[PDB]
Amino acid sequence: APGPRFLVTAPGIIRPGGNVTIGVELLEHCPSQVTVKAELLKTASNLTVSVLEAEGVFEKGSFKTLTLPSLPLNSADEIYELRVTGRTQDEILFSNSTRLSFETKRISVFIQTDKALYKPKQEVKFRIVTLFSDFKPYKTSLNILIKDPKSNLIQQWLSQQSDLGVISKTFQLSSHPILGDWSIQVQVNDQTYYQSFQVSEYVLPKFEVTLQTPLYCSMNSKHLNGTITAKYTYGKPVKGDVTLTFLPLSFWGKKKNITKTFKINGSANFSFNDEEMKNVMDSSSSPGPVEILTTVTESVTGISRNVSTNVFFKQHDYIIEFFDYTTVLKPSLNFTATVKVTRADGNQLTLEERRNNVVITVTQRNYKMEAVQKINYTVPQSGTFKIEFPILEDSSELQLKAYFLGSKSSMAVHSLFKSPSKTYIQLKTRDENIKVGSPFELVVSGNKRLKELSYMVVSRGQLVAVGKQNSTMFSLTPENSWTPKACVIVYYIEDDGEIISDVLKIPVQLVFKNKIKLYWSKVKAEPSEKVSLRISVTQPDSIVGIVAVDKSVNLMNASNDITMENVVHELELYNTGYYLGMFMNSFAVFQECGLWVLTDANLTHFPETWIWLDTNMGYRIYQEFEVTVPDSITSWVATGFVISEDLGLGLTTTPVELQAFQPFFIFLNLPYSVIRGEEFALEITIFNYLKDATEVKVIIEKSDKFDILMTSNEINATGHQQTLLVPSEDGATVLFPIRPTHLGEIPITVTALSPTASDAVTQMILVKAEGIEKSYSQSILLDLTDNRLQSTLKTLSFSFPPNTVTGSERVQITAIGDVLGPSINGLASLIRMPYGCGEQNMINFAPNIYILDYLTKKKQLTDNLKEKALSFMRQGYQRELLYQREDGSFSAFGNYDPSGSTWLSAFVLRCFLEADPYIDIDQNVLHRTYTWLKGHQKSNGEFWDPGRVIHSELQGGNKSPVTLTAYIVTSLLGYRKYQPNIDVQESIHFLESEFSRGISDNYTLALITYALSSVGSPKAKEALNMLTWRAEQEGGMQFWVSSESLDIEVAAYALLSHFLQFQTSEGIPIMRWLSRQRNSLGGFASTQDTTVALKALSEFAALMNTERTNIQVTVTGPSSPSPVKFLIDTHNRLLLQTAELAVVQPTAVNISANGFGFAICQLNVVYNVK
C-alpha cells in the first residue's frame, strides 16, 4: 500500500574503537520481518575491501539498533564507506552506501605534571594516563619523549607498559637548561599527544601594582573612579610616583592620550570627569574599549613597573542581553527567551529601577504582511526574567527589541524551516543542570495532536540511544557515553508521508561511578608535624594517584593536573562539527549534528609540590599515609584520581585543604640568582601572629662563602645579628647587605629568637659568576658509513681568553645520531593539488615533489600520502604539458603568452629532472627545453630572459643577469644523467670571471659557488672559502646577512656546495640553522626556498643513508680522565646525549667513534669575560 515504509539513520563519522550503531524503524507498510545488513568498505585504489559486517532481523513497529563490530585502533585515514541494505524474506527493500568522515581521536590521553612552572635543576614528576572512550583503563605499549624548546629529544622511554593505564615517571632538569616551553610527547599506537610545561627563572619584583577599575563604563557617570595599589611582597605600603596613561583603542583615529602624574603611598584613588574622554569620540562612532596603563616608579630605587588594563565603554544607561532562544523560527509555537538587564558600572540594580517597566516590541514579518506588537514587562532584583509569547503561523522573520529607560537592545531570527502541513514540534527541558544517571524530564509541544513519538539520542557523533514515547512528557536517564553534549532528536510521521522532527542539544554534566575521597588528619597543622592522609576508594584493586601542591597553582588558574575541567575539555575535543548536505528542512534538522537518514517518507610566583603519591592498592578500599608537613607555611591543596578495571576513572569531587600554619615564623623573598662580588640586599620578614608585639633578634649565621658588610651590635662577630620589634598579627622587615664570595649553592641560615618563641630557616642561593656571558660551539661529523674504516679519531680544542672569569667555565659535550628534520605531518600539510595558472601550478607542485624526495631519502614513507602525492604531481605534469609550447618554451598561460621565460623554463626543467626517477618523462620534451635554453646563449656565455614572471616572489628573486646565468647552469647540471655533452664551459668561464671581479650580493655568490662546485672548477673551493668567511657564526649558529627568504636560499646553496666539495663537517652549523628555520612556523615560508632547503636535507640523508647504526663514541683527553661513552643506534638516533667535562686550560678532547653509520659530536664551552 502507499505510504511510509521505513526509516534508517546512521552517524556520518567513523572513529577507531567507536561502535558504528545505526537505528532502524519500520512503522506500517513494512513486511513482517526485514533483515538489515550493514557493511564497512575500505575502498582505496579501486580495492573495495569489505572490513566489518553486521546483520539483524527486525519486526513491524519495532524501533531498534544494529551495532557493527568496533573498528580496531590500528586503522588510519582511509576512505571509508558504510553500506546499508534492507531486504525482505524474498525481495530487496532498499540498498545504499555513503562516505564516512574519519576522526583521528580514538582514546583519551592525560599528561599530569605536578606543576606548570619549573626552576632549573628541579625534578619534573609526571603521570601518563591512557583511557578508552568509555574511561576504562587501556593497557598498551607507548613511547615518551621529553624535548627542549629547540625540539632536541633530550630524554625518552621506549615501549613502556601501562599497568592499569598509569605510568608515573620523573625527569631531572639540567643545571642550565634551555628556558622556555619544554614539551612531553607521548606516542601511542601511531598517534602523538603533547603537553607543554614552562621552565624559567624567578626574577621577583620587589613590589606589585594592582589596578582596580570597573570593567564596564558609561559616559553619563560624573565620577569614573579607580584605585592603584602598589604593595610590597611583605605587605608594607609603597611610596612612589604614578603616571597614568588613558588611551582610546580606536586605532582608525589618533592615538592622543590623557596623562596624569601624581604620588602614591601604598594606595591612591583617582577619578575622571566627563570632559576627559570626549576626545575618544573625537578621534574617530560607537565607543569601544580603552586602555589604561599605570607606571609606578619608586622615589628611592627608581624601579618602574607598568601595568595595563582594558575598560569597555557602553553607550547606554544599562546593558540588556538575551539567552535561551531558538536560533530557528518555529511558527504557531509559544516562543520563550530570558532577558537579563544590568547596570553600566556593573553594580546591582536598584529597587527604584524595578518599578519601571521594560518595553518589549516584537515584529513578525512574512518576508508580505507584518505584525508589530508591544508588551509591558517587569524586572526582578537579580534582573533575569523569562519572556514568553506565541508566534503567528505566517511569521517568517522575528525581530525582538527591548527598551528600558533609554537602554536599548535588539535581536532577530531569520532562519525558518518550511512545513507544507504547517505542523511543528518544540522540544524543551526544565532541568537547568543535567547529570549522568540522574533522570531529567523533557517536554514536547505541538500545534496538532501528536502520535507516538520516536526519540533518539546521539553523542560524540555516535547514536547512543533510541526508543518510543507514547506521551507528550518523558524522562530520560543520561549515561557516561552521553557526555559532553547530547542531541535529543524527536520525530513522528504524518498520514501524507510528511516527517515532523525537532532537535535539542543539551550539555550533560559528568559524574563518575568510581569515587575517591581524601581526608586530612588535621585541617590546621604546625610545620614539621606528622599528618596522616586517608584515601577512600569505592572498589578495591584500584590504582590511585594523589597530588598535594601549594594553593598558588589554583591562583594561576592554568595547570596540567587532571581536573574536571581537563576531562571536560577532552570530551569536547571528542566532539566534532556538523556537516552540510542538500539543505532540505527535514534532512537539515537531522544533519544539525551529523545524522544521515534514508527513508521513503519524502514524496511530494612559583608553586612547590609536597606529595606525589602513586599507589597500587591490592585489597584495601581505603588506606592511610603518614607524611610530614614541610617547613613552608601555606595552604596545601590535595586532589587525586583512581583508575579501576571495572568502574574506570574517578576524580575527587573537591580539593582538600590543609592549612600549614604557625603563629610566629620567618620569611625570605630571596632572588633566584645573584652575581659573585656584588653587594645585594637580603630582606627577612619576621611574621608574628601572637597577641603582643615582640622584640625579636634576627641572627645571620657566619660563613666563609659570603660576607656581611655593616657591623652588628656585638664585637665577637661582625654583622652577626640585628634586633627589631614585630607588631602583633603583622610582619616586620629587616635588611642585610650580603656580598657572596663563592660559586654555586651557598647556604644562608636565619634564626629569629624571641622570649615567646623562636624559629630558624636555612635556604640555598645559586650564586653565579659575574661578567658578560660568551659561548663557543664546535661540531664534527664522524662518518663510519664506509666499511673500509671502522674507527675514526677527531680532536676538538678550545682555549679560554686571558680575561675569563674564574669559576665561570662550563664544558659540555653532546652526541647525536641525526639532525632534526621537519615533522612528517607538517610537510604533509604542504602537499596539495596543484591548480591555477602555470605559476600557481608550480608554486603548489614544487614543495610536494621536493618533500617526496626528502621523505624517500629519509625512509619515512606512508603509502597513502605517497599515492596522493603521486596522483598530484602526475596531474601537475599533465597541466604543465598543457602549458608547454611547440618550441619547448614554458609560460604561466602557455601559448597565450607571447614569449616564454628562460628562468621559468629552467625551473620546470629542474622539476622534471627531479621527477624522472618517480615517473616517465618524455625525453623529447627535455631535449626541446634544452635546445630552447641553449638558443639564448650569447658569445660570452651570458643569457637573457625574454619572458616575464607574473608572481612577484618568483619574479623578485634577484633579476640581474648573473643570477639568471647561474640559475640556468644550475638547472642544466642535472642533464648529465641522459648525456654528459653539455657545452657550458664559456658560461662557466664567464661566472669565474665575475667571481674574480668580486661579487657583493650573498645569493648571487651562493648560486655562483654551487655552479662552479657542481662542475668541479678549481676556483669553487676558494669561492666557498670566501663565502664562509662572510658567514656569521655565533654560538654554533651559522647563517648569512641579507641586503635588506634570501637567507634560506644562500644557506641551502652553501650547504650543497659544502657537500659537493666533501667538506661535510663544516656544513653542520649551517644545517642547524636550516633546522631552526622550520620549528618556528612548521614547514618553510613561501615556496622558492622550501625546494632548496629540502633538497639540501635530502642530499645529507643520501650521503649517509645507512639504515643500521651501532656507533660507540668514546671521549678521552685531559678534560675527560674517565672515558665518556655514548652508544647510538636506531632507537636513540635522535637522542641528544650529553655529558659534562672538567675545566682545564686548554680544553681539548679526543673523540673516537667505532662502529657503523654516522654521528655528530658537538663541544660547547660557556664562560664569562670581564
Ligand SMILES: *[C@@H]1O[C@H](CO)[C@@H](O)[C@H](O)[C@H]1NC(C)=O
Ligand atoms: C562494541 O560492541 C561490542 C560487541 O557488540 C562490545 O563488546 C564493545 O564493548 C562495544 N564497544 C564499546 C566502546 O562500547
Ligand SMILES: *[C@@H]1O[C@H](CO)[C@@H](O)[C@H](O)[C@H]1NC(C)=O
Ligand atoms: C540511495 O540508493 C538508492 C538505490 O540506488 C536510491 O534509490 C536512493 O535515491 C539513494 N539515496 C541517496 C540519498 O543517495
Ligand SMILES: *[C@@H]1O[C@H](CO)[C@@H](O)[C@H](O)[C@H]1NC(C)=O
Ligand atoms: C505598562 O503597562 C501599564 C499598565 O500595567 C501601562 O500604564 C503602561 O502604558 C505600559 N507601558 C507602556 C510603555 O506602554
Ligand SMILES: *[C@@H]1O[C@H](CO)[C@@H](O)[C@H](O)[C@H]1NC(C)=O
Ligand atoms: C503563550 O504565551 C502567552 C504570552 O506569554 C501566554 O498568555 C500563553 O498562555 C502561552 N501559552 C502557551 C500555549 O504556552
Ligand SMILES: *[C@@H]1O[C@H](CO)[C@@H](O)[C@H](O)[C@H]1NC(C)=O
Ligand atoms: C689524543 O690522542 C693522541 C694520540 O696520539 C694523543 O697524542 C693526544 O695526547 C690525545 N689528546 C689530545 C687532546 O689530543
